[PDB]
């Protein structure tokens, strides 16, 4: 409702300047993820983005301005090119 890939996502380690995010390793094969982050209410793409390979289940975001509300969103791509699967988002105040 509507369900996403990955299904669950949480911050498992914080410093004031950076975050380690972790998500449930999905059942279906993912070639790669794309991960955005930016101040809650940034437009349009959501802020800075980077790629992580499909085998990985963790990502580290750094260089964050401390005590600031960030939206962090993960997009899973199950083929080389095309539409991502339904993304998952979390908000975190550093």
């Amino acid at each position: 409702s509507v369900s996403s890939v990955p299904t669950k996502l949480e911050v498992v380690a914080a410093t004031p300047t950076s975050l380690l995010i972790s998500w449930d390793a999905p059942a279906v094969t993912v070639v790669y993820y794309l991960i955005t982050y930016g101040e809650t209410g940034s437009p349009w793409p959501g802020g800075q983005a980077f790629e992580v390979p499909g085998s990985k289940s963790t990502a580290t975001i750094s260089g964050l301005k401390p005590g600031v509300d960030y939206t962090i969103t993960v997009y899973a791509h199950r083929s080389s090119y095309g539409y991502s699967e339904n993304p998952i988002s979390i908000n975190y105040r550093t």
Binding site: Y32, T36, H77, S80, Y81, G82
Partner: protein
């Protein structure tokens, strides 16, 4: 490689793109593609949009490890042509 395409504007600064796009004759959603001063050998898309004045919004074209491109991680493409075709 991109030089033949009309939408690619070679040797065009970010500020020059603002002037080019804001100049008269450009309807809303007028766009171009430029070399990114923003980030080394990659490209950017500049577009005419209105912000509650009229303005030029710049979007970074980000690269994938497989060589493809994306502006938004919701959709990725093999090349720019495919990206440009889609966003038109």
């Amino acid at each position: 490689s991109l030089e033949p395409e009309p939408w690619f504007f070679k040797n065009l600064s970010r500020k020059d793109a603002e002037r080019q796009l804001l100049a008269p004759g450009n309807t809303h959603g007028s766009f171009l593609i430029r070399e990114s001063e923003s980030t080394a050998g990659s490209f950017s898309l500049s577009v005419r949009d209105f912000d509650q004045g009229e303005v030029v919004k710049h979007y970074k074209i980000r690269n994938l490890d497989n060589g493809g491109f994306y502006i938004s991680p919701r959709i990725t493409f093999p090349g720019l042509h495919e990206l440009v075709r889609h966003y038109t």
